[PDB]
């Protein structure tokens, strides 16, 4: 097939990027730095929302330092009009590299949180390993769902740039605003109208950023105390459930790359 | 030293109760005989500087209207303005003005003495280290001492292991220590009001007391200082405006940055509705001093609200409701009095500076900026601290600014 | 036949930015686009590329749509300016083009040794030169018989002994029976191995057809030098009978000029009466026949 | 004077910077909003300008310069400045005042409408002592991104390629600005039997934006120390920009 | 005056020597070739005419001084090769930008940004400019004053081929009032109606130094023949091939003929008389072969 065709480029590609083998090794000392912190301060809330903190700055960041110049950077570097020669279609050349860039990101966590796994159950003695493959496996299998939104996200600026230095701009610009403004700006909204601007509304406004709909995921049985949590403590205002939460981080992802192949085709 | 019948009392009433006319006396008196005696205000018995003024000795005695000038300053023979002996039962000083170097009342081992809307001022010249005390009471069980004023005495209302005992709206002005408490077991003391004083309450080893409605404005260094109280009662205390200084003695206390509360070694003490407000500390939690009942306090104007150099976690709201503190950016969704997220007044930065006072030029830098954000993302690397869930979005102290 | 296209008039905007060419092309010839480097050559390239859409008329790339995969895996495009992955090999990233158009795995050793590659083969793209990218563009072209080649100016950045063997490359690919288009801007040199050419401008193509044919058709001056004969005085004698133009030089070295309707009995004269020395025949090239094109269209 | 010609070039390019005028303008909206929450709800307020200055002043200087040598040299402008009437010094001090004057603006728009935002929301601010604090602060946040200035010039003439000169202005701000008071607290909190903490504010010295905090918190040295400290931050790293820019 | 009179020097990195004996000698009003491959052989050189570089063990006397003084580089153009200047700059603030530093008067950038045809895409951003509109900017500073020595480090590079006619009559304008140039191309075919003596020199040394009539006279090169519209090889190539002088038979109706142009070119000039083609291009040996020559005769 070519979508795999040239995923297996981008596997090939995104690994010797030297730049993310420093912040996904960063991710890694990281995770076993915070995981052997969460053992010695023996708590067990405040190990999780850490490392869903900690990966709420890193996985978006290996993202968007992927992906930011996968569509310009393959234009202006000429190479992008040369591949419509090839037998592909724009929905080929694009699903690859999410397919591509995923499987990198997919590899990033698993290093990263997988490290995490054995400084855990290698430290803390008598640990019910069944609670933690359970814990650990959810951090898995949704901090590459975090990452594939803002691998969506970055495709969707480069569809739309036709220059890489303005495709870094834009990617610096995402990741501000999706992982510490929008933070900020609902935190600025509740503390100057005091928790009175809507009492009903203001938790639905938590499923309109998916680094927050990934803190649910991942705090929604550890949940413990309120000052650990901040402004994520209105998802307890949130009547959904958790398989909810799962699905609405893939339509954060599907909508993102229906919008990211919808600009691609009129490229 | 004279008697008291050797002046001219003019009698208005035969039944022990005597009236002196107005115009001034001289010498020490002193009372053996339970006379009821009252004064015109003209009555200005001002001894020559030396003994005690009117010593009492027989039980009831209903001391009234006098003023009282310039008696000695010996504090190891008591050179006293009243002295009351332990025989001198149920004695009444109301009403009464003191200007001397010395102990304006001095009691020991009295019952049922009321010392009550005196003026005591005591000293101008003397280094607050001779001046004598205000109203010094030593191991009396059941007084009555209210509404009085003593200005410029030496550390204020002294009390020496006196059971028990009420202290009701009385005027603490330009003294070393406000009230002073040394083993003072089952006290009370109620809306008392010190003003520009080196530690407005010296509450030290007494337990059981009750601590209600009292007023501190613009005292030095300490704002309330309990050293080793235990089971006792915190209720309504407005302290406002500790400023930094020293003692001039540090005899048993040491200089402060500004308190406006010191804990030392207190384990169990309710500690509620109170207000401190414009200080440099607003509460300083010693190590020694866990587990007790923290909960809807003001925490207004305070440069850095708790001090609690520890690691143990310490949540202060008993019942579910907390404190109001004046830098919490907090929101209220659900409708009650209560706070939605808990608040940590301290940091790990903020443990820092305490540890180290060189990190004070660091505290500008952005790399602690970054490490302030790094704890609110981080919850890991906060120590356990002195974080309370539910506090108060409104001021529960409207009534204790007036 | 190759490429047919006929009454392409591509507009968008209503810029119309070309304009009615019928360009056919030959199971063998070797075309030649030499418009601008602006909207008039560039966008007939995108129409037998596949990746445009013709507005107002038809192009049939090998008999079919030109946006069909079964098509695609026998175009071969050299694109202009292609830095192409600079933190994969030589190749690597020609392996991975081989699997897209699906040409067998084999030809990438034997493409990165027949272009002149093998020396910086399973080396960064970043380390290498501009003309070794090229090399590279070019490897990527010929994979898995391309049944119709499209070069993008393939000798710009490109050494003067390689564009020499490029073009022995290119003729080694006529007579393999493929079609070669040369969207060029480096029109002197490469009038030996094209075999039409086609001149356009401002959208409509001005001219096609051989290299006799434009020069026929187009009446431009042959200039013709002859130094070293034995005198000139007699024989600018012998050329103020014609009436075109001379100039000496050293000896005798008259640059006369005919205007291709004297030049055959012209140099009857030179062989039965002198002893010339050096005469250069320079027919009207490529680049003066363009210098008239675009003079003519304006 | 070529010093100045190849300056107003850098002014022409600096101004037209779209990486420079988003940063610039978040510059200036964040001393707005720092000025705001300073006077409705003075030292308290130009510390945490102090903070702001600290975080960008130094991005801008590394947003400005970290192309200056190398981004000409792949450009291909470099190599053709050389071969005009230049020296190699006039180039450096050259792009120094042009790059310079840009965020000696920068300020003025920045600063100047922060002071604009005290002067006219405190109502009694009493301004003898509001344009001495601030001119104190126009004038030491103009000399810390001059610093950084000077150390991008330095960074930049050492690499070859435009890509590895932002991957060092990047680590030359993280090193400068949040490592080594890292790891000032490191040597703190986990060293103290052989660390004496006197030594501690004689270290500050070593770091131009802890020099640059010192003289708007007004400490063992005066303050005229630290003015000459600061510029001999500048004087040092142009002449060490000088040393590299002459070897390529 | 000479202009550039590299006297013998050797140029070296470490122990190996890039550039070895260079002996270049330019006159007042030539026009050179600096031919050459991409690498550190023409490239070195290149920088030694400027003040780029020293000279190892030699001197060069740039207009009779050393290249490095500011006398000099006032009146000396010099176009790189891949040049991308400040793209957020305009066209006419480059170049008024340009002539600032050479000490050039402001009213010669109007006149300059006319000459290279510049008038209608000036004042826009260099970022939308095209890769000959940077050539033709590239050109115009080098023109800034009057320039005594021009260094056009491939001037003819993204051009389109009615400019570089409109280039190289620049140059007939230039060299005519005493401006000797240096060119350092590749697009070999053209330039050789121009240059006056080529300097085709190889990875270290330098080969050949000489005009095109004694570029040809020295290396004994075969003289090409081309015809058109006549019919095949059989009744053509048994006529040379067995007589000593090789005939590469090229595609239908253009088979080019080469011979050693002793006795046998007046026998190719008897062909075409008798069994007349049409286009019938006879060429002298080109830059193009003249280079393929000395490039085989040094490896
Ligand atoms: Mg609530």
Redesign the pocket.
């Known amino acids: 097939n070519q979508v795999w065709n040239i995923a297996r480029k981008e596997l090939s590609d995104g690994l010797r990027n030297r730049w993310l083998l420093a912040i996904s090794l960063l991710f890694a000392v990281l995770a076993v730095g915070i995981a052997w912190l969460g053992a010695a301060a023996s708590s067990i809330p405040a190990t999780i929302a850490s490392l869903a903190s900690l990966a709420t700055f890193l996985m978006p960041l290996i993202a968007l330092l992927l992906a930011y110049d996968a569509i310009v950077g393959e234009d202006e570097g000429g190479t992008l009009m040369l591949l419509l020669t090839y037998p592909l279609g724009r929905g080929q050349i694009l699903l690859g590299k999410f397919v591509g860039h995923g499987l990198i990101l997919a590899l990033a966590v698993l290093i990263g949180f997988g490290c995490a796994a054995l400084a855990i159950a290698l430290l803390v003695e008598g640990v019910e390993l069944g609670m933690l493959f359970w814990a650990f496996g959810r951090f898995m299998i949704s901090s590459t769902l975090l990452g594939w939104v803002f691998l969506a996200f970055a495709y969707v600026l480069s569809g739309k740039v036709n220059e890489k230095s303005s495709a870094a701009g834009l990617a610096l610009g995402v990741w501000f605003l999706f992982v510490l403004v929008f933070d900020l700006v609902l935190l600025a909204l509740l503390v100057l109208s005091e928790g009175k601007f809507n009492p009903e509304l203001l938790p639905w406004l938590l499923l309109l950023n998916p680094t927050d709909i990934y803190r649910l995921i991942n705090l929604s049985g550890f949940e413990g105390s309120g000052s650990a949590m901040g402004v994520l403590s209105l998802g307890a205002d949130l009547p959904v459930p958790a398989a909810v939460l799962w699905l609405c981080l893939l339509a954060w992802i599907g909508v993102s790359l229906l919008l990211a192949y919808a600009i691609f085709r009129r490229r | 030293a004279p008697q008291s019948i050797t002046t001219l009392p003019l009698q208005p009433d035969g039944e022990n109760r005597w009236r002196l006319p107005a115009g001034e006396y001289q010498g020490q008196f002193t009372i053996e005989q339970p006379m009821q005696l009252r004064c015109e205000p003209g009555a200005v018995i001002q001894s020559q500087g030396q003994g005690s003024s009117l010593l009492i000795s027989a039980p009831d005695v209903l001391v009234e209207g006098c003023t009282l000038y310039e008696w000695g300053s010996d504090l190891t023979a008591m050179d006293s303005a009243v002295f009351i002996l332990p025989a001198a039962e149920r004695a009444q000083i109301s009403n009464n003005r003191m200007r001397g170097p010395g102990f304006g009342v001095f009691v020991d081992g009295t019952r049922d003495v009321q010392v009550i809307g005196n003026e005591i001022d005591g000293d101008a010249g003397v280094r607050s280290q001779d001046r004598g005390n205000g109203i010094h009471l030593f191991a009396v069980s059941g007084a009555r001492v209210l509404h009085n004023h003593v200005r410029n005495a030496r550390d204020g209302i002294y009390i020496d292991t006196s059971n028990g005992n009420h202290l009701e709206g009385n005027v603490i002005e330009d003294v070393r220590y406000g009230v002073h408490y040394m083993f003072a077991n089952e006290n009370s003391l109620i809306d008392n009001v010190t003003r520009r004083t080196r530690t407005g309450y010296a509450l030290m080893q007494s337990r059981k007391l009750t601590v209600t409605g009292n007023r501190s404005e613009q005292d030095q260094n300490y704002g309330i200082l309990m050293n080793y109280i235990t089971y006792s009662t915190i209720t309504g205390n407005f302290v406002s405006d500790v400023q930094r200084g020293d003692t001039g003695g540090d005899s048993m206390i040491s200089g402060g940055e500004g308190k406006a509360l010191f804990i030392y070694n207190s384990l169990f003490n309710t500690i509620e509705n109170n207000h401190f407000e414009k200080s440099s500390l607003g509460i300083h939690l010693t190590a020694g001093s866990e587990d007790n009942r923290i909960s809807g306090n003001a925490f207004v104007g305070n440069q850095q609200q708790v001090k609690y150099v520890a690691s143990r976690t310490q949540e202060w709201s008993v019942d579910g409701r907390g404190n109001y503190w004046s830098d919490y950016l907090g929101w209220?969704?659900?409708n009650?009095g209560?706070?939605?997220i808990a608040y940590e007044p301290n940091d790990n930065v903020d443990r820092l500076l305490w540890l180290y006072p060189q990190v004070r030029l660091l505290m500008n830098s952005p790399s602690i900026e970054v490490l302030r954000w790094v704890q609110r993302a981080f919850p890991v690397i906060k120590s356990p601290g002195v974080q309370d869930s539910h506090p108060l979005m409104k001021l529960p102290t409207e009534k204790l600014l007036t | 036949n190759a490429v047919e296209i006929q009454g392409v008039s591509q507009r968008y905007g209503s810029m119309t930015v070309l304009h009615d060419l019928n360009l056919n092309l030959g199971e063998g010839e070797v075309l030649g686009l030499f418009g601008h480097n602006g909207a008039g050559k560039t966008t007939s390239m995108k129409l037998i590329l596949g990746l445009l859409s013709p507005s107002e008329g038809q192009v049939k790339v090998l008999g079919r749509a030109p946006n069909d995969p079964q098509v695609r895996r026998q175009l071969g495009y050299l694109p202009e300016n292609v830095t192409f992955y600079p933190q994969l090999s030589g190749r690597e990233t020609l392996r991975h083009f081989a699997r897209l158009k699906g040409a067998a795995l084999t030809q990438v050793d034997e493409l990165l040794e027949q272009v002149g590659l093998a020396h910086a083969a399973d080396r960064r793209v970043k380390t290498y030169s501009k003309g070794m990218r090229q090399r590279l563009g070019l490897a990527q072209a010929l994979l898995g018989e391309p049944r119709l080649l499209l070069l993008d100016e393939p000798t710009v950045g490109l050494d003067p002994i390689a564009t020499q063997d490029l073009y022995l490359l290119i003729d080694r690919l006529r007579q393999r029976g493929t079609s070669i288009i040369l969207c060029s801007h480096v029109l002197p040199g490469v009038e030996a191995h094209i075999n039409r050419a086609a001149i356009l401008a401002k959208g409509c193509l001005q001219a096609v057809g051989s290299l006799s044919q434009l020069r026929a058709e187009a009446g431009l001056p042959v200039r013709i030098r002859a130094s070293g004969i034995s005198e000139r005085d007699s024989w600018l004698q012998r050329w103020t009978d014609a009436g075109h133009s001379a100039r000496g030089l050293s000896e005798s070295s008259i640059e006369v000029v005919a205007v291709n309707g004297h030049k055959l009995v012209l140099l009857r004269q030179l062989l039965g009466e002198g002893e010339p020395e050096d005469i250069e025949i320079h027919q009207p090239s490529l680049e003066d026949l363009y210098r008239y094109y675009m003079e003519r269209a304006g």
Do not use: I
């Open positions: 209220d969704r659900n009650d209560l706070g939605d």
